[PDB]
Amino acid sequence: GSHGGSPRVVRIVKSESGYGFNVRGQVSEGGQLRSINGELYAPLQHVSAVLPGGAADRAGVRKGDRILEVNGVNVEGATHKQVVDLIRAGEKELILTVLSVGGESESKV
Amino acid sequence: GSHGGSPRVVRIVKSESGYGFNVRGQVSEGGQLRSINGELYAPLQHVSAVLPGGAADRAGVRKGDRILEVNGVNVEGATHKQVVDLIRAGEKELILTVLSVGGESESKV
C-alpha cells in the first residue's frame, strides 16, 4: 500500500565473497521525481536479492530496499553501472542509506 | 540490460479460480514519461507472479510483463486500484497488451 519508504542506515563489511546482495535498476540516467513517503526522489536502484547468511543478510539489508546514499553520495537518478561502481570502489565497508519498500500494492486477479 | 520492452498481446479467459496472476505497482496516479525501448510511457503496473498451471501461465503471461493496455484502455499512469478494477470488471476474457521486461540490469555485489 502507500506506507513504507522510510530511511535507515545499513553498514556492511565485505567478505572474500562480497557484500552478499544483488542490486537491480535502470540502465539509463535521470528520470522524474516521484513521491516516496512525502518527498520527491529521482529513480533509485533496489536490492533484488540477498544471499542467505551473507554479510548483507546479517547486517539487516532487506529485499526491495531502495538505495538512496552509498558511501556519502546521493544516487537518485544514477545509472545501474554508477551505483554498482560506487559499491565496488575498493573499500571494505559499505555504508548505505536505504528506503524500505513502500508505495506499491499487489492484487490477485 | 537496455534491451526488451517489446509489445505483445495476451488473451486470457478466467477460470472459476480467476486469471491466475498478481499485478503489482504504484498506488498513486500519474508519474513521468520514461523511455522503454525508444518510446516514452508513464508508469505501468506489472505482473509480479503467475500461478503455475493457471490460465495466464497457459496463455503466455510472463513474470515482470508491464501492462500497457487492458481491454482496449491505455493504463499508463493509472493507479493500482484502477488497473485491478479494469481486469475485474466482470467480463470473462481479458485482452492485454504487455511490454516484456527490459531496461534494467542486475549485478552481484
Side-chain angles (χ1 to χ4, degrees):
Chain A
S2 61
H3 295 109
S6 83
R8 83 187 187 277
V9 169
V10 186
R11 307 180 181 92
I12 308 103
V13 180
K14 49 173 153 189
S15 50
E16 277 280 78
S17 58
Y19 295 114
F21 70 104
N22 277 39
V23 174
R24 176 185 299 192
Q26 64 180 18
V27 175
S28 60
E29 47 199 335
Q32 210 198 51
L33 310 104
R34 150 187 98 85
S35 219
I36 287 90
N37 203 31
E39 307 125 293
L40 305 182
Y41 302 96
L44 303 178
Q45 305 286 311
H46 68 277
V47 175
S48 49
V50 174
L51 187 76
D57 196 24
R58 300 180 297 95
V61 181
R62 306 200 297 259
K63 185 191 166 67
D65 278 339
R66 296 191 269 354
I67 297 170
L68 183 66
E69 303 166 352
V70 175
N71 294 337
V73 179
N74 173 286
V75 291
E76 290 175 55
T79 68
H80 179 76
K81 290 173 178 200
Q82 282 161 356
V83 177
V84 165
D85 283 355
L86 257 150
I87 299 163
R88 292 175 179 163
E91 281 174 10
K92 302 305 191 187
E93 190 165 19
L94 172 70
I95 296 176
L96 301 179
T97 306
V98 294
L99 307 185
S100 60
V101 296
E104 295 187 301
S105 281
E106 175 171 328
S107 303
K108 177 173 283 215
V109 102
Chain B
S2 61
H3 295 109
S6 83
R8 83 187 187 277
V9 169
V10 186
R11 307 180 181 92
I12 308 103
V13 180
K14 49 173 153 189
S15 50
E16 277 280 78
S17 58
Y19 295 114
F21 70 104
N22 277 39
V23 174
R24 176 185 299 192
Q26 64 180 18
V27 175
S28 60
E29 47 199 335
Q32 210 198 51
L33 310 104
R34 150 187 98 85
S35 219
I36 287 90
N37 203 31
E39 307 125 293
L40 305 182
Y41 302 96
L44 303 178
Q45 305 286 311
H46 68 277
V47 175
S48 49
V50 174
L51 187 76
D57 196 24
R58 300 180 297 95
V61 181
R62 306 200 297 259
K63 185 191 166 67
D65 278 339
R66 296 191 269 354
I67 297 170
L68 183 66
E69 303 166 352
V70 175
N71 294 337
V73 179
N74 173 286
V75 291
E76 290 175 55
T79 68
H80 179 76
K81 290 173 178 200
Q82 282 161 356
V83 177
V84 165
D85 283 355
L86 257 150
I87 299 163
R88 292 175 179 163
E91 281 174 10
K92 302 305 191 187
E93 190 165 19
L94 172 70
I95 296 176
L96 301 179
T97 306
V98 294
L99 307 185
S100 60
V101 296
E104 295 187 301
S105 281
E106 175 171 328
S107 303
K108 177 173 283 215
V109 102

Short mmCIF file of all heavy atoms in Angstrom, two decimals, chain A residues 1-2 17-27 31-32 46 48 80 84 87-88 103-109, chain B residues 1-2 17-27 31-32 46 48 80 84 87-88 103-109:
data_model
loop_
_atom_site.label_atom_id
_atom_site.label_comp_id
_atom_site.label_asym_id
_atom_site.label_seq_id
_atom_site.Cartn_x
_atom_site.Cartn_y
_atom_site.Cartn_z
N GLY A 1 0.85 -1.25 0.00
CA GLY A 1 0.00 0.00 0.00
C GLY A 1 0.85 1.25 0.00
O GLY A 1 2.07 1.20 -0.30
N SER A 2 0.26 2.39 0.36
CA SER A 2 1.02 3.66 0.34
C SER A 2 2.06 3.86 1.49
O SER A 2 2.86 4.81 1.47
CB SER A 2 0.04 4.83 0.29
OG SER A 2 -0.77 4.79 1.43
N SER A 17 33.80 -13.18 -0.14
CA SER A 17 32.65 -13.43 -1.01
C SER A 17 31.71 -12.18 -1.28
O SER A 17 30.50 -12.35 -1.62
CB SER A 17 31.83 -14.61 -0.44
OG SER A 17 31.38 -14.36 0.89
N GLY A 18 32.25 -10.97 -1.14
CA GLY A 18 31.47 -9.76 -1.44
C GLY A 18 30.53 -9.38 -0.31
O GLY A 18 30.62 -9.91 0.79
N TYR A 19 29.62 -8.42 -0.59
CA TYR A 19 28.61 -7.94 0.39
C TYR A 19 27.39 -8.87 0.52
O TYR A 19 26.71 -8.86 1.54
CB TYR A 19 28.16 -6.57 -0.03
CG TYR A 19 29.29 -5.56 0.05
CD1 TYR A 19 29.82 -4.96 -1.10
CD2 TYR A 19 29.79 -5.17 1.29
CE1 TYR A 19 30.83 -3.98 -0.99
CE2 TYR A 19 30.79 -4.23 1.41
CZ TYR A 19 31.32 -3.66 0.27
OH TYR A 19 32.34 -2.75 0.43
N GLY A 20 27.15 -9.71 -0.49
CA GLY A 20 26.13 -10.80 -0.36
C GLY A 20 24.73 -10.25 -0.71
O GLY A 20 23.74 -10.66 -0.10
N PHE A 21 24.67 -9.36 -1.69
CA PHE A 21 23.38 -8.98 -2.28
C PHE A 21 23.51 -8.59 -3.76
O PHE A 21 24.64 -8.37 -4.27
CB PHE A 21 22.64 -7.87 -1.44
CG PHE A 21 23.26 -6.49 -1.46
CD1 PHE A 21 22.70 -5.49 -2.22
CD2 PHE A 21 24.43 -6.20 -0.72
CE1 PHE A 21 23.24 -4.19 -2.21
CE2 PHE A 21 24.94 -4.89 -0.71
CZ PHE A 21 24.37 -3.90 -1.44
N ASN A 22 22.35 -8.47 -4.45
CA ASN A 22 22.27 -8.06 -5.86
C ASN A 22 21.52 -6.77 -5.93
O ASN A 22 20.61 -6.57 -5.14
CB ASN A 22 21.56 -9.12 -6.74
CG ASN A 22 22.47 -10.24 -7.19
OD1 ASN A 22 23.33 -10.72 -6.43
ND2 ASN A 22 22.17 -10.76 -8.37
N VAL A 23 21.91 -5.87 -6.83
CA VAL A 23 21.30 -4.56 -6.94
C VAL A 23 20.64 -4.62 -8.32
O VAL A 23 21.22 -5.17 -9.20
CB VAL A 23 22.39 -3.45 -6.92
CG1 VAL A 23 21.80 -2.04 -7.20
CG2 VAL A 23 23.09 -3.51 -5.59
N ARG A 24 19.46 -4.06 -8.48
CA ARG A 24 18.80 -4.08 -9.78
C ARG A 24 18.25 -2.69 -10.04
O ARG A 24 17.71 -2.05 -9.12
CB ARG A 24 17.63 -5.10 -9.73
CG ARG A 24 16.80 -5.09 -11.06
CD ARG A 24 15.58 -6.01 -10.92
NE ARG A 24 16.01 -7.38 -10.65
CZ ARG A 24 15.15 -8.40 -10.72
NH1 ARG A 24 13.87 -8.17 -11.06
NH2 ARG A 24 15.55 -9.64 -10.47
N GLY A 25 18.28 -2.20 -11.26
CA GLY A 25 17.57 -0.94 -11.59
C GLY A 25 17.93 -0.44 -12.96
O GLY A 25 18.54 -1.16 -13.80
N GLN A 26 17.60 0.82 -13.21
CA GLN A 26 17.59 1.38 -14.58
C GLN A 26 18.96 1.41 -15.11
O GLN A 26 19.95 1.69 -14.39
CB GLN A 26 16.96 2.80 -14.63
CG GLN A 26 17.77 3.90 -13.82
CD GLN A 26 17.14 5.30 -13.89
OE1 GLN A 26 15.97 5.45 -14.23
NE2 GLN A 26 17.89 6.29 -13.55
N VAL A 27 19.07 1.17 -16.41
CA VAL A 27 20.37 1.27 -17.10
C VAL A 27 20.71 2.72 -17.44
O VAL A 27 21.85 3.10 -17.41
CB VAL A 27 20.33 0.40 -18.39
CG1 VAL A 27 21.64 0.57 -19.24
CG2 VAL A 27 20.24 -1.07 -18.01
N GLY A 31 15.54 10.65 -14.91
CA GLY A 31 14.17 10.23 -14.58
C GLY A 31 13.45 11.27 -13.72
O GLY A 31 14.09 12.17 -13.14
N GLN A 32 12.12 11.14 -13.60
CA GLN A 32 11.38 12.17 -12.82
C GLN A 32 11.22 11.87 -11.35
O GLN A 32 11.16 10.72 -10.93
CB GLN A 32 10.01 12.50 -13.41
CG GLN A 32 9.51 13.97 -13.16
CD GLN A 32 7.99 14.10 -13.36
OE1 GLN A 32 7.21 13.32 -12.79
NE2 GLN A 32 7.57 15.08 -14.18
N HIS A 46 17.46 -0.84 -6.50
CA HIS A 46 16.98 -1.52 -5.31
C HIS A 46 17.67 -2.84 -5.12
O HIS A 46 18.30 -3.41 -6.06
CB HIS A 46 15.45 -1.70 -5.37
CG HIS A 46 14.99 -2.66 -6.43
ND1 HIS A 46 14.82 -2.28 -7.75
CD2 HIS A 46 14.68 -3.98 -6.38
CE1 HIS A 46 14.47 -3.34 -8.46
NE2 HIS A 46 14.37 -4.38 -7.64
N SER A 48 17.58 -6.50 -5.18
CA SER A 48 16.72 -7.51 -5.78
C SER A 48 16.81 -8.85 -5.08
O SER A 48 15.87 -9.61 -5.16
CB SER A 48 17.03 -7.69 -7.29
OG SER A 48 18.41 -7.84 -7.35
N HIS A 80 22.61 2.15 -13.31
CA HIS A 80 22.95 0.95 -12.64
C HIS A 80 24.45 0.82 -12.55
O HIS A 80 24.98 0.59 -11.48
CB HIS A 80 22.41 -0.26 -13.41
CG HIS A 80 22.75 -1.57 -12.76
ND1 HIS A 80 22.09 -2.02 -11.64
CD2 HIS A 80 23.68 -2.51 -13.05
CE1 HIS A 80 22.54 -3.22 -11.31
NE2 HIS A 80 23.53 -3.53 -12.12
N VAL A 84 26.69 0.42 -8.94
CA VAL A 84 27.50 -0.79 -8.74
C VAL A 84 29.01 -0.38 -8.59
O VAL A 84 29.70 -0.88 -7.70
CB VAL A 84 27.26 -1.76 -9.89
CG1 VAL A 84 28.34 -2.87 -9.94
CG2 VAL A 84 25.85 -2.36 -9.74
N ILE A 87 29.65 0.93 -5.07
CA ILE A 87 29.76 -0.19 -4.13
C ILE A 87 31.10 -0.94 -4.27
O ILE A 87 31.72 -1.37 -3.26
CB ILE A 87 28.54 -1.17 -4.32
CG1 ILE A 87 27.24 -0.43 -4.04
CG2 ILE A 87 28.68 -2.42 -3.37
CD1 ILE A 87 26.03 -1.22 -4.61
N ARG A 88 31.53 -1.19 -5.51
CA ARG A 88 32.75 -1.93 -5.80
C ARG A 88 34.03 -1.05 -5.88
O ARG A 88 35.04 -1.51 -6.42
CB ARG A 88 32.61 -2.68 -7.13
CG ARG A 88 31.60 -3.83 -7.09
CD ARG A 88 31.53 -4.36 -8.56
NE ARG A 88 30.63 -5.49 -8.68
CZ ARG A 88 30.16 -5.90 -9.86
NH1 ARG A 88 30.57 -5.25 -10.98
NH2 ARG A 88 29.35 -6.93 -9.93
N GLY A 103 4.80 2.13 -1.16
CA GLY A 103 4.21 2.88 -2.28
C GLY A 103 3.70 2.05 -3.44
O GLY A 103 3.30 2.62 -4.46
N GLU A 104 3.73 0.73 -3.27
CA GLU A 104 3.14 -0.21 -4.27
C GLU A 104 2.17 -1.14 -3.58
O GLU A 104 2.40 -1.55 -2.43
CB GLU A 104 4.21 -1.11 -4.89
CG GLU A 104 5.26 -0.48 -5.74
CD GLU A 104 6.11 -1.60 -6.41
OE1 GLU A 104 6.71 -2.41 -5.67
OE2 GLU A 104 6.18 -1.72 -7.66
N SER A 105 1.11 -1.54 -4.29
CA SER A 105 0.18 -2.54 -3.82
C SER A 105 0.24 -3.69 -4.79
O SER A 105 0.82 -3.55 -5.89
CB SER A 105 -1.27 -2.01 -3.85
OG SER A 105 -1.46 -1.19 -2.73
N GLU A 106 -0.31 -4.82 -4.37
CA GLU A 106 -0.31 -6.01 -5.22
C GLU A 106 -1.66 -6.68 -5.02
O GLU A 106 -2.19 -6.69 -3.93
CB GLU A 106 0.84 -6.97 -4.88
CG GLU A 106 0.78 -8.28 -5.67
CD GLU A 106 2.04 -9.14 -5.52
OE1 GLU A 106 3.15 -8.60 -5.35
OE2 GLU A 106 1.93 -10.37 -5.52
N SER A 107 -2.25 -7.16 -6.11
CA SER A 107 -3.55 -7.84 -6.03
C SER A 107 -3.56 -9.12 -6.87
O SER A 107 -2.94 -9.16 -7.93
CB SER A 107 -4.71 -6.90 -6.49
OG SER A 107 -4.71 -5.71 -5.72
N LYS A 108 -4.29 -10.14 -6.41
CA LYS A 108 -4.50 -11.37 -7.18
C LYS A 108 -5.69 -11.19 -8.09
O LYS A 108 -6.75 -10.67 -7.68
CB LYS A 108 -4.77 -12.52 -6.21
CG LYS A 108 -5.07 -13.83 -6.94
CD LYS A 108 -5.16 -15.01 -5.93
CE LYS A 108 -3.71 -15.41 -5.51
NZ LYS A 108 -3.67 -16.96 -5.31
N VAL A 109 -5.53 -11.58 -9.36
CA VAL A 109 -6.58 -11.43 -10.35
C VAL A 109 -6.85 -12.81 -11.03
O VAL A 109 -6.06 -13.80 -10.92
CB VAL A 109 -6.05 -10.26 -11.19
CG1 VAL A 109 -5.44 -10.60 -12.47
CG2 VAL A 109 -6.53 -8.89 -10.87
N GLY B 1 19.62 -5.75 -19.07
CA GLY B 1 20.29 -4.62 -19.81
C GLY B 1 19.28 -3.72 -20.48
O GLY B 1 18.07 -3.76 -20.15
N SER B 2 19.72 -2.91 -21.44
CA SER B 2 18.79 -1.97 -22.11
C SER B 2 17.79 -2.60 -23.13
O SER B 2 16.86 -1.93 -23.62
CB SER B 2 19.59 -0.86 -22.78
OG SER B 2 20.46 -1.42 -23.73
N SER B 17 -11.33 -19.96 -10.79
CA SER B 17 -10.19 -19.51 -9.98
C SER B 17 -9.44 -18.21 -10.51
O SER B 17 -8.24 -17.98 -10.18
CB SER B 17 -9.19 -20.67 -9.82
OG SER B 17 -8.73 -21.15 -11.08
N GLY B 18 -10.14 -17.37 -11.28
CA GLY B 18 -9.55 -16.11 -11.75
C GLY B 18 -8.62 -16.31 -12.94
O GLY B 18 -8.59 -17.38 -13.54
N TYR B 19 -7.87 -15.25 -13.29
CA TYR B 19 -6.90 -15.27 -14.41
C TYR B 19 -5.55 -15.93 -14.04
O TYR B 19 -4.83 -16.40 -14.92
CB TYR B 19 -6.66 -13.85 -14.86
CG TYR B 19 -7.91 -13.23 -15.44
CD1 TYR B 19 -8.57 -12.17 -14.82
CD2 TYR B 19 -8.40 -13.69 -16.67
CE1 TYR B 19 -9.70 -11.58 -15.41
CE2 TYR B 19 -9.52 -13.13 -17.25
CZ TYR B 19 -10.17 -12.09 -16.62
OH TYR B 19 -11.30 -11.59 -17.21
N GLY B 20 -5.24 -16.01 -12.75
CA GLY B 20 -4.08 -16.82 -12.28
C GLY B 20 -2.78 -15.99 -12.37
O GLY B 20 -1.72 -16.53 -12.68
N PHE B 21 -2.88 -14.70 -12.07
CA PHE B 21 -1.69 -13.88 -11.84
C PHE B 21 -1.93 -12.75 -10.85
O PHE B 21 -3.10 -12.43 -10.49
CB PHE B 21 -1.08 -13.35 -13.20
CG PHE B 21 -1.88 -12.31 -13.94
CD1 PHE B 21 -1.50 -10.98 -13.90
CD2 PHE B 21 -3.05 -12.65 -14.66
CE1 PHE B 21 -2.21 -10.00 -14.62
CE2 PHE B 21 -3.74 -11.66 -15.39
CZ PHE B 21 -3.34 -10.36 -15.37
N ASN B 22 -0.83 -12.10 -10.39
CA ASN B 22 -0.88 -10.96 -9.46
C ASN B 22 -0.32 -9.77 -10.17
O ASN B 22 0.59 -9.92 -10.98
CB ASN B 22 -0.06 -11.22 -8.18
CG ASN B 22 -0.82 -12.01 -7.13
OD1 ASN B 22 -1.57 -12.94 -7.45
ND2 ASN B 22 -0.51 -11.72 -5.88
N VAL B 23 -0.87 -8.58 -9.92
CA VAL B 23 -0.45 -7.36 -10.59
C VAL B 23 0.15 -6.54 -9.45
O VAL B 23 -0.38 -6.57 -8.39
CB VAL B 23 -1.68 -6.62 -11.19
CG1 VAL B 23 -1.30 -5.24 -11.78
CG2 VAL B 23 -2.31 -7.52 -12.22
N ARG B 24 1.24 -5.83 -9.69
CA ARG B 24 1.83 -5.02 -8.64
C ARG B 24 2.18 -3.67 -9.23
O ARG B 24 2.66 -3.59 -10.37
CB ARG B 24 3.14 -5.72 -8.15
CG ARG B 24 3.90 -4.85 -7.10
CD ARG B 24 5.24 -5.50 -6.75
NE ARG B 24 5.02 -6.83 -6.18
CZ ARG B 24 6.01 -7.50 -5.58
NH1 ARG B 24 7.23 -6.95 -5.48
NH2 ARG B 24 5.79 -8.70 -5.07
N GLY B 25 2.03 -2.58 -8.50
CA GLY B 25 2.54 -1.28 -8.97
C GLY B 25 2.05 -0.14 -8.10
O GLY B 25 1.52 -0.34 -6.98
N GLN B 26 2.20 1.07 -8.63
CA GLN B 26 2.07 2.29 -7.81
C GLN B 26 0.68 2.43 -7.34
O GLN B 26 -0.30 2.12 -8.05
CB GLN B 26 2.49 3.57 -8.60
CG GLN B 26 1.58 3.89 -9.85
CD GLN B 26 2.00 5.16 -10.62
OE1 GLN B 26 3.12 5.64 -10.48
NE2 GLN B 26 1.14 5.67 -11.43
N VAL B 27 0.56 2.96 -6.12
CA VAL B 27 -0.78 3.25 -5.55
C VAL B 27 -1.33 4.57 -6.08
O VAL B 27 -2.51 4.71 -6.27
CB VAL B 27 -0.67 3.27 -4.00
CG1 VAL B 27 -2.03 3.71 -3.34
CG2 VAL B 27 -0.36 1.87 -3.49
N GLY B 31 2.80 10.31 -12.87
CA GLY B 31 4.23 9.97 -12.96
C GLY B 31 4.83 10.43 -14.29
O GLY B 31 4.09 10.75 -15.25
N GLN B 32 6.17 10.44 -14.37
CA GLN B 32 6.79 10.95 -15.62
C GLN B 32 7.05 9.90 -16.67
O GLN B 32 7.29 8.73 -16.38
CB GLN B 32 8.07 11.74 -15.39
CG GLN B 32 8.38 12.85 -16.45
CD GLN B 32 9.86 13.29 -16.42
OE1 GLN B 32 10.76 12.45 -16.48
NE2 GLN B 32 10.10 14.61 -16.32
N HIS B 46 2.85 -4.05 -13.23
CA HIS B 46 3.47 -5.21 -13.84
C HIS B 46 2.99 -6.49 -13.23
O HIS B 46 2.40 -6.51 -12.10
CB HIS B 46 5.01 -5.11 -13.76
CG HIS B 46 5.55 -5.23 -12.36
ND1 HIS B 46 5.61 -4.15 -11.49
CD2 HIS B 46 6.04 -6.29 -11.68
CE1 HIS B 46 6.08 -4.56 -10.33
NE2 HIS B 46 6.35 -5.86 -10.41
N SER B 48 3.58 -9.42 -11.11
CA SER B 48 4.54 -9.78 -10.09
C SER B 48 4.67 -11.28 -9.90
O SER B 48 5.70 -11.72 -9.45
CB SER B 48 4.20 -9.12 -8.73
OG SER B 48 2.85 -9.40 -8.53
N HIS B 80 -2.95 1.51 -9.07
CA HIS B 80 -3.09 0.11 -8.94
C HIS B 80 -4.55 -0.25 -8.88
O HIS B 80 -5.00 -1.12 -9.60
CB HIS B 80 -2.42 -0.36 -7.64
CG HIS B 80 -2.54 -1.85 -7.42
ND1 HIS B 80 -1.79 -2.75 -8.12
CD2 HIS B 80 -3.35 -2.57 -6.62
CE1 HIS B 80 -2.05 -3.98 -7.70
NE2 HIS B 80 -3.02 -3.91 -6.81
N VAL B 84 -6.56 -2.93 -11.53
CA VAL B 84 -7.18 -4.14 -10.97
C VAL B 84 -8.72 -4.11 -11.26
O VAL B 84 -9.30 -5.10 -11.68
CB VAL B 84 -6.86 -4.25 -9.49
CG1 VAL B 84 -7.78 -5.27 -8.78
CG2 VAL B 84 -5.37 -4.62 -9.34
N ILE B 87 -9.39 -5.11 -14.88
CA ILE B 87 -9.30 -6.57 -15.02
C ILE B 87 -10.53 -7.29 -14.42
O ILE B 87 -11.04 -8.29 -14.97
CB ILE B 87 -7.97 -7.10 -14.36
CG1 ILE B 87 -6.77 -6.47 -15.06
CG2 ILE B 87 -7.89 -8.66 -14.43
CD1 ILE B 87 -5.49 -6.62 -14.20
N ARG B 88 -10.97 -6.85 -13.23
CA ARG B 88 -12.09 -7.46 -12.52
C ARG B 88 -13.48 -6.87 -12.90
O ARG B 88 -14.44 -7.08 -12.15
CB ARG B 88 -11.90 -7.30 -11.01
CG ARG B 88 -10.75 -8.11 -10.44
CD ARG B 88 -10.67 -7.71 -8.93
NE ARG B 88 -9.62 -8.43 -8.23
CZ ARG B 88 -9.16 -8.03 -7.05
NH1 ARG B 88 -9.69 -6.93 -6.47
NH2 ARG B 88 -8.21 -8.72 -6.44
N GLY B 103 15.20 -2.90 -19.85
CA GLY B 103 15.63 -1.57 -19.37
C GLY B 103 16.20 -1.52 -17.98
O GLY B 103 16.47 -0.42 -17.47
N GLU B 104 16.36 -2.69 -17.36
CA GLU B 104 17.04 -2.81 -16.04
C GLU B 104 18.15 -3.82 -16.12
O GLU B 104 18.03 -4.83 -16.83
CB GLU B 104 16.08 -3.34 -14.97
CG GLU B 104 14.91 -2.49 -14.59
CD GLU B 104 14.19 -3.14 -13.36
OE1 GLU B 104 13.75 -4.31 -13.49
OE2 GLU B 104 14.09 -2.55 -12.26
N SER B 105 19.22 -3.60 -15.35
CA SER B 105 20.31 -4.55 -15.22
C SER B 105 20.37 -4.95 -13.77
O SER B 105 19.72 -4.29 -12.92
CB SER B 105 21.66 -3.91 -15.56
OG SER B 105 21.79 -3.84 -16.95
N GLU B 106 21.08 -6.03 -13.51
CA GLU B 106 21.21 -6.52 -12.13
C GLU B 106 22.65 -6.98 -11.97
O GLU B 106 23.22 -7.54 -12.88
CB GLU B 106 20.22 -7.65 -11.82
CG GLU B 106 20.43 -8.25 -10.42
CD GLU B 106 19.30 -9.22 -10.01
OE1 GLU B 106 18.14 -9.02 -10.41
OE2 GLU B 106 19.59 -10.20 -9.32
N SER B 107 23.25 -6.68 -10.83
CA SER B 107 24.64 -7.10 -10.57
C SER B 107 24.78 -7.66 -9.15
O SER B 107 24.13 -7.18 -8.23
CB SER B 107 25.63 -5.91 -10.77
OG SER B 107 25.50 -5.37 -12.07
N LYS B 108 25.67 -8.65 -8.99
CA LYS B 108 26.02 -9.19 -7.67
C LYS B 108 27.13 -8.36 -7.07
O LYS B 108 28.12 -8.02 -7.75
CB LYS B 108 26.48 -10.63 -7.83
CG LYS B 108 26.93 -11.24 -6.50
CD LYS B 108 27.22 -12.76 -6.67
CE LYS B 108 25.87 -13.52 -6.72
NZ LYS B 108 26.05 -14.91 -6.01
N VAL B 109 26.97 -7.98 -5.80
CA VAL B 109 27.95 -7.15 -5.11
C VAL B 109 28.37 -7.85 -3.79
O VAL B 109 27.73 -8.83 -3.28
CB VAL B 109 27.23 -5.81 -5.05
CG1 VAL B 109 26.61 -5.44 -3.79
CG2 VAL B 109 27.52 -4.81 -6.12
#
